Design an enzyme around this catalytic site. Structure first.
Site, mmCIF file in Angstrom:
data_model
loop_
_atom_site.group_PDB
_atom_site.id
_atom_site.type_symbol
_atom_site.label_atom_id
_atom_site.label_comp_id
_atom_site.label_asym_id
_atom_site.label_seq_id
_atom_site.Cartn_x
_atom_site.Cartn_y
_atom_site.Cartn_z
ATOM 1 N N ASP A 1 65.726 52.021 19.597
ATOM 2 C CA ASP A 1 64.514 51.481 20.158
ATOM 3 C C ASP A 1 63.442 52.552 20.313
ATOM 4 O OD1 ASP A 1 63.483 49.387 22.846
ATOM 5 O OD2 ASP A 1 62.881 51.498 22.670
ATOM 6 N N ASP B 1 63.271 56.366 11.441
ATOM 7 C CA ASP B 1 63.102 57.670 10.782
ATOM 8 C C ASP B 1 63.369 58.900 11.640
ATOM 9 O OD1 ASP B 1 60.842 57.344 12.386
ATOM 10 O OD2 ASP B 1 59.408 57.457 10.720
ATOM 11 N N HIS C 1 68.459 46.463 29.099
ATOM 12 C CA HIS C 1 68.307 46.801 30.515
ATOM 13 C C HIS C 1 69.397 46.169 31.373
ATOM 14 C CE1 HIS C 1 63.786 47.863 29.899
ATOM 15 N NE2 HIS C 1 64.563 48.915 29.706
ATOM 16 N N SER D 1 62.331 59.829 14.673
ATOM 17 C CA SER D 1 61.080 60.375 15.170
ATOM 18 C C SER D 1 61.238 60.850 16.597
ATOM 19 C CB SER D 1 59.964 59.339 15.095
ATOM 20 O OG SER D 1 60.502 58.022 15.245
ATOM 21 N N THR E 1 56.140 55.851 14.995
ATOM 22 C CA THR E 1 56.238 55.265 13.666
ATOM 23 C C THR E 1 57.279 54.162 13.642
ATOM 24 O OG1 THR E 1 58.072 56.495 12.706
ATOM 25 C CG2 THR E 1 55.955 57.608 12.899
ATOM 26 N N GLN F 1 69.180 52.463 23.327
ATOM 27 C CA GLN F 1 68.002 53.187 23.794
ATOM 28 C C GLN F 1 67.474 54.187 22.784
ATOM 29 O OE1 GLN F 1 68.482 55.472 27.366
ATOM 30 N NE2 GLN F 1 66.481 54.819 28.116
ATOM 31 N N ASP G 1 63.182 55.296 18.847
ATOM 32 C CA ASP G 1 62.785 55.677 17.497
ATOM 33 C C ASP G 1 61.744 54.700 16.948
ATOM 34 O OD1 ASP G 1 62.695 55.757 14.639
ATOM 35 O OD2 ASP G 1 64.568 56.888 14.682
ATOM 36 N N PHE H 1 59.167 52.898 11.222
ATOM 37 C CA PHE H 1 60.379 53.058 10.427
ATOM 38 C C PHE H 1 61.503 53.698 11.235
ATOM 39 C CE2 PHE H 1 56.540 53.651 7.949
ATOM 40 C CZ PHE H 1 56.628 52.613 7.058
ATOM 41 N N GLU I 1 63.910 60.593 30.627
ATOM 42 C CA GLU I 1 63.884 59.538 31.640
ATOM 43 C C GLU I 1 65.161 59.422 32.333
ATOM 44 O OE1 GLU I 1 65.039 56.285 30.403
ATOM 45 O OE2 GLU I 1 65.142 55.022 32.137
#
Ligand code: HEM
Ligand SMILES: *[C@@H]1O[C@H](CO)[C@@H](O[C@@H]2O[C@H](CO)[C@@H](O[C@@H]3O[C@H](CO)[C@@H](O)[C@H](O)[C@@H]3O)[C@H](O)[C@H]2NC(C)=O)[C@H](O)[C@H]1NC(C)=O
Ligand SMILES: *[C@@H]1O[C@H](CO)[C@@H](O[C@@H]2O[C@H](CO)[C@@H](O[C@H]3O[C@H](CO)[C@@H](O)[C@H](O)[C@@H]3O)[C@H](O)[C@H]2NC(C)=O)[C@H](O)[C@H]1NC(C)=O
Ligand SMILES: *[C@@H]1O[C@H](CO)[C@@H](O[C@@H]2O[C@H](CO)[C@@H](O[C@H]3O[C@H](CO)[C@@H](O)[C@H](O)[C@@H]3O)[C@H](O)[C@H]2NC(C)=O)[C@H](O)[C@H]1NC(C)=O
Ligand SMILES: *[C@@H]1O[C@H](CO)[C@@H](O[C@@H]2O[C@H](CO)[C@@H](O)[C@H](O)[C@H]2NC(C)=O)[C@H](O)[C@H]1NC(C)=O
Ligand SMILES: [Ca+2]
Length: 595
Positions: free
Chosen positions: A108, A188, A351, A190, A184, A105, A110, A186, A258
């Site tokens: 993904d 990275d 999932h 994020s 993004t 999770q 990211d 990549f 979540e």
């Protein structure tokens, strides 16, 4: 064809080309085509979009029209008959930890996001969808078939909104409809630092010259940090327990809160940003806040790269990895780094790895208190259980000690996800993630099971007997066809997931391919991939090889007993050792000097 460059993104980014730092937006990675892999642009298309009008309308929208001479089956009917199971006994994975699910999770999240179309501010378009289940425009309801127990309790449908698209968001027409990737492409980190220059700043402590990141002021987890609160009311986290008043965490990714365990690894990541940031000012006192934030941001990036590719991927793709992700040979400026549409459905394989219960354990790895083992459905947008019921320490121990759910053809998605899901805007605990996945396939205009089978170079099953051979399961293949009428029409998600698993891995033939290709493209097409000469200095790389998720836990928690190999199934006490046995990340080579 064309247009050659549609849409409006963050229209204001020109390259430095001499900076050793990734842009928050992901721009300027590629010198030749600089918007490649950035955020807020069309998901790449590996195969041409498939809509009933050929342009934008999903398969299942109009009742009279058909797909290949058959009516597409109702999103939930596919689930009720194939996806769900009652007996939760024996669904646990005996050779993978809850962390194996958990890290899935993280990466993904990211890598991709396709934001919903809740356009508007004071609206009745939201109402006619939820209350009346009126199909049209951006509302695409998930109807209930005959004899669904949810008819008695919930209504006639489950609200469902289409995904956001390119150019603008009012309908329109020209080329086929492409969906937007809000993050993004990549790998990275994020999730932590954000995909918008606007938000990337909001999450920073710009109060001191230390390159630290904004932390919660209200609550404290034994002197260790929490993520900041999202003081944007109304919030889903507040709604679930009103008496508590505890809102969601805020990170660089909207989906951070979540579930309870995803917010937990979000706490660990935010925590080590600051630890690297602090250790770098220990070693390099003359550094300004910008170098600090950026240098820390760079190590953490590399962190998530080494863990994902060295530790996670080899146990996902298994024997299939070397076939798809060969050893590294340098930055290819011709490889498309963008995340494809189908990948956002391939990675959803996870999932069916989420188990029914999340446990909280004490120092002795024993059940923590009266309510140690909670149902998962009570944990959607649950932050009050973190902040006001133990901190992250009990939940982190749970990750390391408790098993993941194993994928099964007779037992697919937990009823805690397939029957009791909470969606942030809506009120009830009763959406179906299996049904939600199945209309998004259709919304995104996915081609069927067979196109993708062929795309990857695998036998395209056309007959009942054919599908049997691939799925190695007579009963499942029969149920699939009784609903879909042809294997050409099977939705990519369920078709790809139904396949038996490859050798030494956790996904089947078709998924190994789709996943395998993406992860190689995002490694090879990334100018900042840690191993690529230039990005990190020869010495810096040698320390980065030593990182482990266990060390992330040790340096940022009061867990003292950790397993070495954190993604395999470990039992207490034998497989657990002291934090001292776990290799430290030496940050010495980052020490820059003067004269
Ligand atoms: C309890 C844990 C989890 C919950 C409650 C959850 C829930 C959700 C929900 C509601 C969506 C939106 C689906 C849609 O509207 O299309 C989603 C998206 C997604 N999930 Fe999960 N999920 C969980 C764990 C995971 C894990 C472990 C993985 C990976 C192994 C994963 C992979 C994905 C991907 C790839 C997407 C689409 C990303 C995108 O926006 O493009 N999920 N999740
Ligand atoms: C809504 O959130 C609050 C927390 O802000 C929950 O209230 C808490 O509920 C538990 C009882 O289940 C109380 O714990 C009790 O005290 C000690 C542990 O501190 C223990 O020895 C007892 O056996 C018992 O577990 C806790 O004091 C209480 N907090 C208060 C005063 O409000 C509540 O359960 C949540 N409800 C929902 C709807 O989830
Ligand atoms: C449960 O999964 C574990 C994680 O992968 C796995 O550990 C793995 O053990 C073997 C040791 O041989 C290694 O895999 C190698 O196996 C043979 C060599 O005899 C080769 O055919 C393979 O190509 C491969 O090189 C892995 O290195 C090792 N995993 C890691 C990274 O620690 C356990 O073996 C699994 N337990 C079960 C159920 O058998
Ligand atoms: C932004 O960074 C600030 C400086 O790094 C930080 O302020 C510092 O916050 C810590 C933790 O709250 C305080 O540490 C402790 O102070 C006394 C020690 O005598 C304790 O009794 C407290 O319990 C507390 O833990 C520092 O006092 C404080 N330092 C300074 C320079 O004032 C901010 O909290 C950061 N703000 C955000 C939003 O991230
Ligand atoms: C970089 O990777 C690309 C893409 O995989 C390679 O480009 C291919 O080159 C072959 C010749 O070997 C051509 O037939 C194709 O046009 C290219 N393939 C694709 C997928 O476009 C290239 O070989 C690699 N270059 C280097 C220097 O490693
Ligand atoms: Ca990213």
């Amino acid at each position: 064809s064309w247009e050659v460059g549609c849409g409006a993104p963050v229209p204001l980014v020109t390259c430095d080309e001499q900076s050793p730092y990734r842009t928050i937006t992901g721009d300027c990675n590629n010198r030749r085509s600089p918007a490649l892999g950035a955020a807020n642009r069309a998901l790449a298309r590996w195969l041409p979009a498939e809509y009933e009008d050929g342009l934008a309308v999903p398969f299942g929208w109009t009742q009279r029209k058909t797909r290949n001479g058959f009516r597409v089956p109702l999103a939930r009917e596919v689930s009720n008959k194939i996806v769900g199971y009652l007996d939760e006994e024996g669904v646990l994975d005996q050779n993978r930890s809850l962390l194996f699910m958990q890290w899935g999770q993280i990466v993904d999240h990211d890598l991709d996001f396709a934001p919903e179309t809740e356009l508007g501010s004071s609206e009745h378009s939201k109402v006619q969808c939820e209350e009346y289940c009126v199909q049209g425009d951006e509302c695409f309801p998930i109807m209930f078939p005959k004899n669904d127990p949810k008819l008695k309790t919930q209504g006639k449908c489950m609200p469902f909104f289409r995904a956001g698209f390119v150019c603008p968001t009012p309908p329109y027409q020209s080329l086929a409809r492409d969906q937007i990737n809000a993050v993004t492409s990549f790998l990275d980190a994020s999730l932590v630092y954000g995909s918008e220059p606007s938000l990337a700043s909001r999450l920073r402590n710009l109060s001191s010259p230390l390159g630290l990141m904004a932390v919660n002021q209200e609550a404290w987890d034994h002197g260790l940090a929490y993520p900041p609160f999202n003081n944007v009311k109304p919030s889903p986290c507040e709604f679930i327990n009103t008496t508590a008043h505890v809102p969601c965490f805020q990170a660089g990714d909207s989906r951070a809160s979540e579930q309870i365990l995803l917010a937990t690894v979000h706490t660990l990541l935010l925590r080590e940003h600051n630890r690297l940031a602090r250790e770098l000012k220990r070693l390099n006192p003359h550094w300004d806040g910008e170098m600090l934030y950026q240098e820390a941001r760079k190590i953490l990036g590399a962190f998530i790269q080494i863990i994902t590719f060295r530790d996670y991927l080899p146990i996902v793709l298994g024997s299939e990895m070397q076939k798809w992700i060969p050893p590294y040979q340098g930055y290819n400026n011709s490889v498309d780094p963008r995340i494809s549409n189908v990948f956002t459905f391939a990675f959803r394989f996870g999932h069916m790895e989420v188990p029914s219960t999340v446990s909280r354990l004490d120092e002795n790895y024993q059940p923590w208190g009266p309510e140690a083992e909670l149902p998962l459905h009570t944990l959607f947008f649950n932050t009050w259980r973190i902040i006001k019921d133990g901190g992250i320490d009990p939940l982190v121990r749970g990750l390391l000690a408790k098993n993941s759910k194993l994928m099964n053809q007779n037992k697919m998605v937990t009823s805690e996800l397939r029957n009791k899901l909470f969606q942030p805007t809506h009120k009830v605990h009763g959406f179906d993630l299996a049904a939600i996945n199945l209309q998004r396939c259709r919304d995104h205009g996915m081609p069927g099971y067979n196109s993708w089978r062929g795309f990857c170079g695998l036998s395209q099953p056309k007959t009942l007997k054919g599908l049997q051979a691939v799925l190695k399961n007579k009963v499942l293949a029969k149920k699939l066809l009784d609903l879909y009428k042809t294997p050409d029409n099977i939705d990519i998600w369920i078709g790809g997931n139904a396949e038996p698993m490859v050798e030494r891995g956790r996904v089947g033939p078709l998924l190994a391919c789709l996943l395998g290709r993406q992860f190689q493209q995002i490694r090879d097409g990334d100018r900042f991939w840690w191993e690529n000469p230039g990005v990190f200095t020869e010495k810096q790389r040698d320390s980065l090889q030593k990182v482990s998720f266990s060390r992330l836990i040790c340096d940022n928690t009061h867990i003292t007993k950790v397993p070495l190999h954190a993604f395999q199934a470990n039992n207490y006490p034998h497989d657990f050792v002291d934090c001292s046995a776990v290799d430290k990340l030496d940050l010495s080579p980052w020490a820059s000097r003067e004269n």
